[PDB]
Amino acid sequence: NQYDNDVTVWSPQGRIHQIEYAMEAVKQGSATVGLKSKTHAVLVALKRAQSELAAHQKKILHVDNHIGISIAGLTADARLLCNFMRQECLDSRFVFDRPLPVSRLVSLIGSKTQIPTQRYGRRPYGVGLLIAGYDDMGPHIFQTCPSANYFDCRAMSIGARSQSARTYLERHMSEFMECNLNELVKHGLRALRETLPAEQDLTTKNVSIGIVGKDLEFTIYDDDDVSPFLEGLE
């Protein structure tokens, strides 16, 4: 009612309804999963196709050799934020000749995304990200939110029916650190599969995979390239 249209209006309960509403854009996105071992960070995403003849929306984006992201929520906000991340990475290599540490990039996102939450006529970013990275401190999975908060994760899922994927991830997370890459991706896929209606399955058409690690620059696997990972599942 009177407290829900402006990001500058606190409610009498100490909440900001426009931020809460922006978070609903992420909850209604298709599910994506991120997880890590001691050597690799992996993203797995379900792609929606609007109709049976459409390609399936891209969910996983390259940021730098050591960083990629999976998105949920408004696609145009995801591109805007991905372009910001890309630029911050390029600047770091230009100035310092070294990769931007992943935690520092996430801090920059938090700062950039907080600004419009405090100014009249601006709005939150309507996108949540899972960020996979590898640097001197090893692999990382971070989560960013429309609130501008961010989280350092052992693993995470965001989007529609992601509560299921989160339950799988908690169930198996004691295994992740010591997993080989193949095992780790399989865990990611199993978690993502929990989000699906009973009839439906993971296919080469609806799964996208992103991987980065010690010996592996951030790489996206789609369509026929996800087949190796989908076989010997179940």
Binding site: E52, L53, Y120, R123
Partner: protein
């Protein structure tokens, strides 16, 4: 009354949702992608016999290898089409190569959500564009059809309808589409479908059709070429 950058409780921007509803006021356009090229077809929607049908241009050349079909608020589409033309020429200038269909579509789609009223230049965009676009072309990935709507979401489609009868037309596209379909079959199918969904009787003056093929540049069908295809249907 609320601001243009207000989220609904469902996490959508009201203005974008409303712009998407404006697309439904547009005339029907169809795109089909085949291994032999893409066709784009559009209902002109003539409102008076005194109007010159050739002055309705709902399919436009972006560059020699890329065309674009539009539906919705047509005047809004002009700055989008011009941006697509200018970007392809910038890319040619800088890189001495043709820009991909996906890249052109991405460039245009980055204008979607650049609206709002306290942040930007003295008379910047006040609202989203009430337009959906089908970009059809050929690059080194082969023939490609992309769809974009006012959210700035863009996606490759094997076949897609937009505008008022797009439900309807999309169902028939599911029925007739197949990956090995020839361009000539796709052209026939899109006119059969337009013929079903159009309120007026289809003829060679109240539709437009264009193709792009690996062979040849963007080609708008002339009246006589339309007449020829219309005979079978």
């Amino acid at each position: 009354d609320r601001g243009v950058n207000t989220f609904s409780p469902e996490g959508r921007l009201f203005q974008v949702e409303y712009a998407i509803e404006a697309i439904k006021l547009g005339s029907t356009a169809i795109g089909i992608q085949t291994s032999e090229g893409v066709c784009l077809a559009v209902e002109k929607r003539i409102t008076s016999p005194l109007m010159e049908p050739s002055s309705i241009e709902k399919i436009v050349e972006i560059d020699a290898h890329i065309g674009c079909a539009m539906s919705g608020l047509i005047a809004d589409a002009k700055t989008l089409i011009d941006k697509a033309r200018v970007e392809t020429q910038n890319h040619w200038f800088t890189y001495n190569e043709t820009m991909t269909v996906e890249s052109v579509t991405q460039a245009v789609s980055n204008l979607a959500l650049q609206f709002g009223e306290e942040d930007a230049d003295p008379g910047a965009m006040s609202r989203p564009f009430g337009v959906a676009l089908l970009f059809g072309g050929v690059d080194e990935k082969g023939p490609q059809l992309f769809h974009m709507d006012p959210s700035g979401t863009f996606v490759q489609c094997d076949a897609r309808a937009i505008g008022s009868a797009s439900e309807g037309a999309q169902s028939s596209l599911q029925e007739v589409y197949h990956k090995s379909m020839t361009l000539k079959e796709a052209i026939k199918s899109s006119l059969i479908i337009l013929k079903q969904v159009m309120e007026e009787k289809l003829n060679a003056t109240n539709i437009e059709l264009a193709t792009v093929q690996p062979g040849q540049n963007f080609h708008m069908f002339t009246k006589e070429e339309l007449e020829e295809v219309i005979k079978d249907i």
